[PDB]
Amino acid sequence: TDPVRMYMREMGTVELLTREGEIDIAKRIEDGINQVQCSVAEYPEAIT
Amino acid sequence: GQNMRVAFMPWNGYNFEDSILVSERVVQEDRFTTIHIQELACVSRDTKL
Amino acid sequence: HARSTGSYSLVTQQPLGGKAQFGGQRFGEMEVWALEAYGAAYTLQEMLTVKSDDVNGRTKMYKNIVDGNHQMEPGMPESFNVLLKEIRSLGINIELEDE
Amino acid sequence: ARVTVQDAVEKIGNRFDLVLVAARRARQMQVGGKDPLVPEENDKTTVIALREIEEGLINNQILDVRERQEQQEQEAAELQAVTAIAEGRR
Amino acid sequence: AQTKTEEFDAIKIALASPDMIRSWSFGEVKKPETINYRTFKPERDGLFCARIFGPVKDYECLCGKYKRLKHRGVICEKCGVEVTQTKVRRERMGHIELASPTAHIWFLKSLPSRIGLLLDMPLRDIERVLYFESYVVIEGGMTNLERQQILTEEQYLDALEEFGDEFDAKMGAEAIQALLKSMDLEQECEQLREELNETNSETKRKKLTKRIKLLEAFVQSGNKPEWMILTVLPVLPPDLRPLVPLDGGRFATSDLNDLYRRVINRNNRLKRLLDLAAPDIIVRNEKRMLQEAVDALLDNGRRGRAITGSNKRPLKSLADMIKGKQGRFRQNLLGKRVDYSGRSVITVGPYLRLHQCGLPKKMALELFKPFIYGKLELRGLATTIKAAKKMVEREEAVVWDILDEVIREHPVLLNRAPTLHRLGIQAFEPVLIEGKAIQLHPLVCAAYNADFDGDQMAVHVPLTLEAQLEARALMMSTNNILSPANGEPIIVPSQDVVLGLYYMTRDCVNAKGEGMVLTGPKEAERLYRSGLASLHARVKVRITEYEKDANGELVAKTSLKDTTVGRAILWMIVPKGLPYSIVNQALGKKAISKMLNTCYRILGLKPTVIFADQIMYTGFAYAARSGASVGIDDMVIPEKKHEIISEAEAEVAEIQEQFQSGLVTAGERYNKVIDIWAAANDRVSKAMMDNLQTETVINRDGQEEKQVSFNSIYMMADSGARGSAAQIRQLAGMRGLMAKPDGSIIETPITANFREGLNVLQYFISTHGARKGLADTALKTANSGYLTRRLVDVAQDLVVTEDDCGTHEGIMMTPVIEGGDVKEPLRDRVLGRVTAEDVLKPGTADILVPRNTLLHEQWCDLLEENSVDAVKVRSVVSCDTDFGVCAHCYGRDLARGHIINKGEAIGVIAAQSIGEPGTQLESSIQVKNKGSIKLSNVKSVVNSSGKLVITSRNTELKLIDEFGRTKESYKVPYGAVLAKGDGEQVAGGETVANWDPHTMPVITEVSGFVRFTDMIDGQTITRQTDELTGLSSLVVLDSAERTAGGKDLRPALKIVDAQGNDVLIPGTDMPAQYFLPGKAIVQLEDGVQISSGDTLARIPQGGLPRVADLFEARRPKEPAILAEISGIVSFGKETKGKRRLVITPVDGSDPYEEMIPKWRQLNVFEGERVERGDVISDGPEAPHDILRLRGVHAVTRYIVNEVQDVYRLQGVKINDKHIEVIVRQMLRKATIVNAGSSDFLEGEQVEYSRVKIANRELEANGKVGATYSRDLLGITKASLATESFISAASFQETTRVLTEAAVAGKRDELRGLKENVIVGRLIPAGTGYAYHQDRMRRRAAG
Ligand SMILES: Nc1nc2c(ncn2[C@@H]2O[C@H](COP(=O)(O)OP(=O)(O)O)[C@@H](OP(=O)(O)OP(=O)(O)O)[C@H]2O)c(=O)[nH]1
Ligand SMILES: [Sr+2]
Ligand SMILES: [Sr+2]
Ligand SMILES: [Sr+2]
Ligand SMILES: [Zn+2]
Ligand SMILES: [Zn+2]
Secondary structure (H helix, E strand, O other): OOOOHHHHHHHHOOOOOOOOOOOOOOHHHHHHHHHHHHHHHHHHHHHO | OOOOOOOOOOOOOOOOOOOOOOHHHHHOOOOOOOOOOOOOOOOOOOOOO | EOOOOOOOOOOOOEEOOOOOOOOOOOOHHHHHHHHHHHHHHHOHHHHHHHHHHHHHHHHHHHHHHHHHHHOOOOOOOOHHHHHHEEEEHHEEEEEEOOO | OOOHHHHHHHHOOHHHHHHHHHHHHHHHHHHHOOOOOOOOOOOOOOOHHHHHHHOOOOHHHHHHHHHHHHHHHEEEEOOHHHHHHHHHHH | OOOOOOOOOEEEEOOOOOHHHHHHEEEEEOOOOOOOOOOOOOOOOOOOOOOOOOOOOOOOOOOOOOOOOOOOOOOOOOOEEOOOOOHHOOOOOEEEEEEEEEEEOOOOOOOOOHHHHHOOOOOOHHHHHHHHOOOOOOOOOOOOOOOOOOOHHHHHHHHHHHHOOEEEEEHHHHHHHHHHHOOOOHHHHHHHHOOOOOOOOOOOOHHHHHHHHHHHHHHHHOOOHHHEEEEEEEOOOOOOOOEEEEOOOEOOOOOHHHHHHHHHHHHHHHHHHOOOOHHHHHHHHHHHHHHHHHHHHHHHOOOOEEEOOOOEEEEHHHHHHHOOOOOOOOOOOOEEEEOEEEEEEEEEOOOOOOEEOEEEHHHHHHHHHHHHHHHHHHOOOOOOOEEEHHHHHHHOOOHHHHHHHHHHOOEEEEEEOOOOOOHEEEEEEEEEOOOEOOOOOOOOOOOOOOOOOOEEEEOHHHHHHHHHHHHHHEEEEEOEEOOOOOOOOOOOOOHHHHHHHHHHHOOOOOOOOOOOOOOOOOHHHHHHHHOOOOOOEEEEEEEOOOOOOOOOOOOEEEEEEEEEHHHHHHHOOOOOOOOOOOHHHHOHHHHHHHHHHHHHOOOOHHHHHHHHHOOOOOOHHHHHHOOOOOOOOOOOOOOOOHHHHHHHHHHEEEEHHHHHHHOOOOOHHHHHHHHHHHHHHHHHHHHHHHOOOOOOOOOOOOOOOOEEEEEEEEHHHHOOOOHHHHHHHHHHHHOOOEOOOOOOOOOEEEEOOOOOOEEEEEEHHHHHHHHHHHHHHHHHHHHHHHHHHHHHHOOOEEEEOEEEOOOOOOEEEEEEEOOOOOEEEEHOOOOOOOOOOOOOOOOOOOEEOOOOEOOOOOOOOOOHHHHOOOOOEOOOOOOOOOOOEEEEEEEEEOOOOOOOOOOEEEEHHEEEEEHHHHHHHHEEEEEEOOOOEEEEOOEOOOOOOOEEEEEEOOOEEEOOOOOOOOOEEEEEOOOOOOOOOOEEOOOOOOEEOOOOOOOOEEEEOOOOOEEOOOOOOOOOEEEEEEEOOOOOEEEOOOOOOOOOOOOOOOOEEEEEEEOOOOOOOOOOOOEEEEEEOOOOEEEOOOOEOOOOOEEEEEOOOOHHHHHHHHHOOOOOOOOOOEEOOOEEEEEEEEEEOEEEEEOOOOOOOOOEEEEOOOOOOOOOOOOOEEEEOOOOOOOOOOOOHHHHHHHHHHHHHHHHHHHHHHHHOOOOOOHHHHHHHHHHHHHHEEEEEOOOOOOOOEEEEEHHHHHHHHHHOOOOOOOOOOOOOOOOOOHHHHHOOOOHHHHHHHHHHHHHHHHHHHOOOOOEEEOHHHHHHHHHOOOOOOOHHHHHHHHHHOOOOO
């Protein structure tokens, strides 16, 4: 089968990040959502 | 399957190609009467109706 | 074995045997050559439509026998009607064009 | 003709055209009345139609001439109705 | 104009548009749902639906609120279901909206790729983009990448940073759709035609022409390359892929339903993933399987192989429904179930007539079931249909009376499996007989391959008046007394009938009652049945015979004839319009068959049918009166059987002494010992025909012994009723020789006959041939059945179009003579054929024989007295008749007594006439007439032995008679011995020239000793056995099987004198060294002295497969070399043992050269004037080479003669007209030389170019005369080139044809016979031919 082989080869290039490497990405997620939440708070219609 | 009287002679087209004649005595005397037992099944089934 | 009319199969609307009456005799392509070699045209027409797959053909022709008409009045056989939908489902346009 | 049809084939020509000519005559005797030209000594409609070809009483030419007459006889005996209809349409 | 009329004439196939798919659809399938587990009903918007496809019940809604047939076409507001019949679920379709564009498998994987050829890109480059591995460039400008460039992710990243914006490149199937979007079809065709001007090429030109042929066909139809990638996917109706509850309770679903679910599932997931965060890795992988999901749905057997959810089987895809030996396209012909049909075991019917059959009572009541109900309510016996049903089931006495009335005058067809020819289905008028078995007429049983031992026949009943008439006028046995294969009658008495007439006509020495005068043939019956005279003995009888008058009929000649009592009674059976001389002789199968053949043309069709039955009735009666019985005493053994055997038994032991001594070698013993037993087997067989043939001896009148034996076995053999002379050999005389598993014949044959007890070893020996011969018979029907299938598919679409074709051109017909014996005379060959040119032969005074007329059986008799030779008659090959045969310029119908009427399919009869009897599948010139041998171009040289061997390439033989004229013409090849030289008188029956038929000898010029220079044993030459001279001889091997040690060695014989020096060849001072080619066999040894004329070395050159090989036009292993251009031709240069032929005429240009293999022996030496089509290498000729040079006439007669030679040896009679029909189907499709309208190569029909050339040279604005060369295509090479996609996909590969028809946009107008069988329309042949002409004429006007 073809579709089974190359899928394992696409994610094979991407290496696993562990421990404190996961937190580095996780910190950008929560700071990314908070920046959006700051933009909604600044908008006057959102309060209305 | 029993044995009968056999005569190798042409007839009036009743033994054209491999065809074999029989006497009424073959039918009268049970010499080629075969018994056949047959099975017939009736199944009562449960349906959605 | 002998059959005039009876039950028909689901996927293809051609004769099928099971109960009461026996199954019909298959008219193969070797038998088709014979009628093609002969001047026969209406007999093969019967073998393909009213005796086989044609749904509207068989019942309408059967009533003509009882009435004393002996007329075919053939149409589209179910052997080709299924074939048309199978090509359309592939993604290839197939249509019937008039005169 | 029950056994051989050769006597009827010679009258028209083609064996296939013989079928279509006799089929028109058979269907006329089957549904639309039509009295047999050749004395009906039992037999079915398929053979009686071939009996008329052998004597030379029915043909593709003869069937067309008689169909022209029957169409015009049903036209003249119904002209009274057609003329009335056409007046209301205009 | 009509809009709602469904009467179609043509069907077209093209690519479907995404908007066009929505037109077929009635709703969108968004859910993979089928049926609820609680209530068995369709669900919301799944595969099975009532809102989209239709209601499950007849005229009802899902809930059950809307009931009765009252509501019609009402759209529900509660459910959304249209109140209609459930047959709507069989016609209505759905659609699935794809989130991502997925490619079609039929246009991608199917070779040589429809998407690939259109974009000029290999499949490896397309798949890597589609599969998501690399990017592809669509738009180009100043980005250095131009077009169709494959780029990796790392290459694409750097390329965008340098340029970007204006640069456009996408990834996946979206890129391919965009690539087909941007391409301009109008400008691509202009660029390709410009480049094909200076650089043309030859082999690489084919792929450039392939692109143009694909592009030009794409624009003219208007398919648009954008629809190649699927965006909207159509769905099948639920009825075709059903979920039905079975008898048990477990459901049964189609494999299509399982495939459709695994398409929607990932389609719904992709719609989710595109809005719920889209990482490329997962999104590309979901698009990867979605493309595979459609691929598995359409054609599963291409990319991977899908497995069913519960079963371990490949699922039936959409492509697998059409093809797969048994599908939907192929079941239209073969797998067709038929109503009004019966089947029973066959039985004899001697009391029945030729037009009568013995159909069973209970079968006929079941078959004519609706016919009974029709003529029961009409009579006033039954009230209604249901009351008539009860009368039939109860088997009432009155029903049997009505049943006989309906059956009378109603024909019934009888079919037997298998049908090889058309006579397998014949109509008969049934006679009601009680029993479960069907009775068949003994005479028509010869037409079928039937034997009353356990055979079954299909019983078909026609329904309509048209069907009833074409059964009586065409398919009736009385109308079909002759065979369609040959002019000889097929309905011929056999077995019992032949034996009855044989005993009746044969005479004895002195039987009861002899020397009486007898008043009429009536008194002959008065004596026999009473008991006063026997059937035999020569008794004078008064007879009144009626001969045919010139006008007919008044001739009544009465004379006293010297016949027997039995011959006089049979005259009463013989009709009036037939001579008495035909019944005067002792009648056998050969003689009785001549009676019906003569009775047909002299009287007619009706008189011979009544006579045919009258022979049968009388045949059985007198066969019963005779009382022939096969006894053990009738199996007479020759007087001195073991006496002959003993003379040959120890004669083998005599050569066994030579086996050990060395007089006769071990290899020469086997073929010499076997000749003794072969001569002994014939000696016993000839001695057997003395104690069985004429063994009577005891004669009461006189003292004589000469009489035909009254033995029961000989009576069956001499008459030809049952059992030939070969069968009698094994039973009474000797069985003969048997074969080994290898193929060789066993040393000692079986001496014991079937009269005595065979040995245990002898019986085990005889079993090999029994289990090998019948094993060949088991696959004989399969091989010949495929041969019948092969010949049909190429010639089926051929019918008679015109009554006469305006060409006075045909084929030269000469009686076939092999060496010095006539196989078939002119009468049998030119019978039926219509002449093209008048008879101009002088012999008897007359005013010309008219042309363009049918040659009657009596008209051919006139040509016999005049002795006519070489008559050019109008044939099937030479026809310029649009699309078909031209009736008059063809010949007679063999089944009928006149010309074949227009409309009848010739090609179907022609294929069946050869496929049916296919189941049964010179060296020295001798002169009889006195004269004198005169020789020209003689180069003969006398050798040491005393053989006049000629040293010339071309030699002809001529005879000079008493007056001084040439009598016979014969050709003499190289390496032949002549008996007499120039001007020598010959006697009646003497051989003048002799040579070995299967060899090519090499003759030396100089005399002396033989040297073996460069002839090292083992390295170049090997030792085996020559099978012609023979003994142990050296074999020269070609440059392929030689060892690595001796690479550069030339095999040649050097001629030296007594001293050791070379004897020079007269002419050049070069040493004598004859270079020997490969395969050649050397007979001479080292040191042996030879004279001028001695041979140095000799160079060596089935049944049903042979017939199949000739019809397929396959070239032999060793093709014959022929000269191509006429003129002064000379050889050029040399290599080792080969010559390069340079052919140059006298006129302008003419640049031509040839290359010839080394082992070939030529028929020209140096500086020879050779013509077009001359033999250079002797042996088999290539079918393509004859058409290339000799023309389109010598090749056509080559196919006829070579095929007939196979059937003549087996004993089969097939006319030459049937073969030439298939030949015309081989010659079709021709290559164009001159520029006309489209390309140079291509593929256009001969008549298609003939319509073109007739239109271009006069009008149509072209003025160019397109020159064409005829091409030969052997059946399968011609059957692929049909101008119909419906006809092609029937026997050819389905997926290739349907894709080719879609891209080109082909239209099938339904003209072929096979085309109309599939669609369910009338055949453009026979009865439907007159119907078809009514619609074809109204296409131009309207
Ligand atoms: N035994 C026998 N009889 C033959 C044969 N050929 C013809 N007949 C008989 O001749 C009768 C008429 O046959 P046709 O073929 O119509 O002859 P026709 O045209 O000259 O009248 C039929 O009688 P019918 O069926 O009673 O028809 P009808 O007389 O009621 O019309 C048929 O039985 C034959 O080969 N053998
Ligand atoms: Sr009447
Ligand atoms: Sr047989
Ligand atoms: Sr058999
Ligand atoms: Zn409802
Ligand atoms: Zn012609």
